[PDB]
Design a protein around this ligand. Sequence first.
Ligand SMILES: OC[C@H](Cc1cncs1)Nc1ncnc2[nH]ccc12
Ligand SMILES: [Cl-]
Length: 167
Amino acid sequence: VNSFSGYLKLTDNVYIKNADIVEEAKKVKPTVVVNAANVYLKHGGGVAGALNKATNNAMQVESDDYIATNGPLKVGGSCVLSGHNLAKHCLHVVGPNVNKGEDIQLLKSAYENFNQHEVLLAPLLSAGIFGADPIHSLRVCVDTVRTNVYLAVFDKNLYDKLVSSFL
Ligand SMILES: OC[C@H](Cc1cncs1)Nc1ncnc2[nH]ccc12
Ligand SMILES: [Cl-]
């Protein structure tokens, strides 16, 4: 039993809800919130900009130190950093950005990072401003993640389309 509320159950392990991931994280304070990161951990817009704003820029400050020490992430890769006031940990995961010409096949690799964590609050990787098809991102999530994932879909109209089209 966990404290996630109001989710539709898609499979044994994947749940979905129309919600603002920032507000969800503040309410649940999950062990792991997933950020839709880029390789530079520059949290400007989309989920990343919103999460970082909610931390009063502490996420960005921590991220800049991480990059100065370790260099950029790989597309498809991840790192674990603090969750600040939102969660215990933030798993920064880099899905491919179609608006940069990155290989959509890397989306499966990106979702594989979720399997290192028993329970996660997450967005659909490569969706939104990353330019991939969200219906595809959900399919890859369901077919790749084996741990318990609670998906927050900000757009109510998109959420209804994802539910009604889910196979
Ligand atoms: O796939 C990630 C989606 C993509 C979008 C598609 N249409 C509108 S945003 N983004 C978000 N998802 C959940 N919470 C969020 N908070 C802030 C952004 C955000
Ligand atoms: Cl987005």
